[PDB]
Amino acid sequence: GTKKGVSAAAFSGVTAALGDVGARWFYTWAADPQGITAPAGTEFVPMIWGRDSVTADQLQRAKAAGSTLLAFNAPDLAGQANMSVETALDLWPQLQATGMRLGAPAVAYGGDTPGGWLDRFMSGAAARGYRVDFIPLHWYGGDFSAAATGQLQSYLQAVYNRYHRPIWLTEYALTDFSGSTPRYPSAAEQADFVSRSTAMLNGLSFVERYAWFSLSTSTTPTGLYTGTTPNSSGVAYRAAG
Numbered sequence: 001g002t003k004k005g006v007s008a009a010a011f012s013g014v015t016a017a018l019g020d021v022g023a024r025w026f027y028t029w030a031a032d033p034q035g036i037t038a039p040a041g042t043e044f045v046p047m048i049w050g051r052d053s054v055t056a057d058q059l060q061r062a063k064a065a066g067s068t069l070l071a072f073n074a075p076d077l078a079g080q081a082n083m084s085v086e087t088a089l090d091l092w093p094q095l096q097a098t099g100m101r102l103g104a105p106a107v108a109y110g111g112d113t114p115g116g117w118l119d120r121f122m123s124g125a126a127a128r129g130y131r132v133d134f135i136p137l138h139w140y141g142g143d144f145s146a147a148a149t150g151q152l153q154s155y156l157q158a159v160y161n162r163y164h165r166p167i168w169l170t171e172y173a174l175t176d177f178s179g180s181t182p183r184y185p186s187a188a189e190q191a192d193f194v195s196r197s198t199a200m201l202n203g204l205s206f207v208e209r210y211a212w213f214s215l216s217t218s219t220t221p222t223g224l225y226t227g228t229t230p231n232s233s234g235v236a237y238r239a240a241g
């Protein structure tokens with residue numbers, strides 16, 4: 001019912017796609033829907049992406065566009081928000097001052113690692129008396145077998161066990177980035193993982209929300225829909241609770 005969402009971008013048919021797949025919520029990596037008209041029953045969640053995303057105007061835009069706030073995207077990656085724990089802590093009061101339910105920055109990896117980016121952020125927030133309501137995560141599996149769903153579950157459990165905040169999974173797919181270019185599963189491998197991973201997540205009481213990366217093949221080869229047509233993975237996501 002309540003957990004299943006998606007990342008999305010404006011394309012011809014986005015509204016129908018969101019409706020047909022049964023998304024309860026969506027985000028755009030921006031402070032507003034970036035031209036997308038949401039179907040009825042589909043909640044937009046704003047994001048404050050990076051350092052230069054933190055202005056009065058963006059924070060007010062976000063608060064008018066929704067009731068929950070996602071903080072910086074992959075601050076631990078040079079190619080994304082690319083930010084120190086200290087820069088993220090120093091901007092935090094501006095995000096807190098909106099009064100919105102507030103999600104931690106979403107780390108690319110290492111969320112459970114002592115001394116990692118997330119651990120220093122949460123440790124510093126607690127010492128400053130800051131509020132962090134939930135922890136959003138990213139996960140991309142390189143093992144394309146039936147074992148993948150268990151590997152994802154282990155990472156989510158470890159982050160819950162470390163910080164005891166409710167968990168969102170705001171990007172997930174099978175993709176191996178270890179090599180010089182990305183490596184993807186066969187279509188049948190992907191659809192089996194969609195089924196087994198959603199069943200696992202729908203039943204895990206400390207996961208509040210999840211978002212397959214991503215709605216549309218025009219964003220990523222792991223896309224669920226081309227225009228308004230679902231592939232076997234979109235079919236599997238639509239059939240999830």
Ligand SMILES: OC[C@H]1O[C@@H](O[C@@H]2[C@@H](O)[C@H](O[C@@H]3[C@@H](O)[C@H](O[C@@H]4[C@@H](O)[C@H](O[C@@H]5[C@@H](O)[C@H](O)O[C@H](CO)[C@H]5O)O[C@H](CO)[C@H]4O)O[C@H](CO)[C@H]3O)O[C@H](CO)[C@H]2O)[C@H](O)[C@@H](O)[C@@H]1O
Nearest residue numbers: 028029030049050051052053073074080081082108138219
């Ligand atoms: O200071 C750091 C950099 O600041 C930049 O300017 C900011 C500007 O980039 C930002 O615009 C938004 C885009 O960042 C955003 O792009 C989304 C991607 O972040 C996302 O990346 C995922 C990633 O999270 C995951 O780990 O790996 C995925 C798989 O490889 C990867 O794809 O992908 C999304 C899908 O393509 C993509 O949309 O999109 C937003 C929505 O359009 C943009 O708003 O906005 C900021 C202002 O609010 C700018 O400060 C500079 O360009 C850089 O030079 C700096 O290094």
Ligand SMILES: [Zn+2]
Nearest residue numbers: 086087089090
């Ligand atoms: Zn400082």
